[PDB]
Amino acid sequence: KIITKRPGEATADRSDPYGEMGFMSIKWYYGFMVFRPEWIALLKTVARL
Amino acid sequence: KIITKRPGEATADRSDPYGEMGFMSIKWYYGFMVFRPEWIALLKTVARL
């Protein structure tokens, strides 16, 4: 999701009556599910022999 | 007078770039002015005989 506010009339912003600032933001959701966890293998080793 | 702001691009500003809050407000005016206050009668008692 992308929200863009460009400088100008769209940012009247009483605390700044000229609207010389703008911004843009991105936002999303994420989730993870696992089926059959026994099918994933991990080996933890040291490096650099 | 009813003013409603829904969360999203309308609310988003410098303080909250994502605009995740909305609100709704209602306001009005009212006055009262009386002629002949002797035509209104009041009687004050107790209850539950």
Please name the method used to determine this structure: cryo-EM
| Residues in Cβ contact with B3 at an 8 Å cutoff, skipping those fewer than 6 apart | B24, B25, B26
Half-sphere exposure of B24 toward its Cβ, with a 13 Å CA cutoff?
A: 3
Burial class of B46 by CB neighbour count within 10 A (0 to 12, 13 to 18, 19+)? exposed
* Residue A20 near chain B (CB below 8 Å): no
| Cα–Cα distance, A25 to B16 (Å, whole number) | 10
Burial class of A20 by CB neighbour count within 10 A (0 to 12, 13 to 18, 19+)? exposed
The pair phi, psi for residue B2, each rounded to 5°, is -120, 130
Select the residue from A9, A21, A25, A26 to test the B interface by mutation, using most B Cβ atoms within 10 A: A25
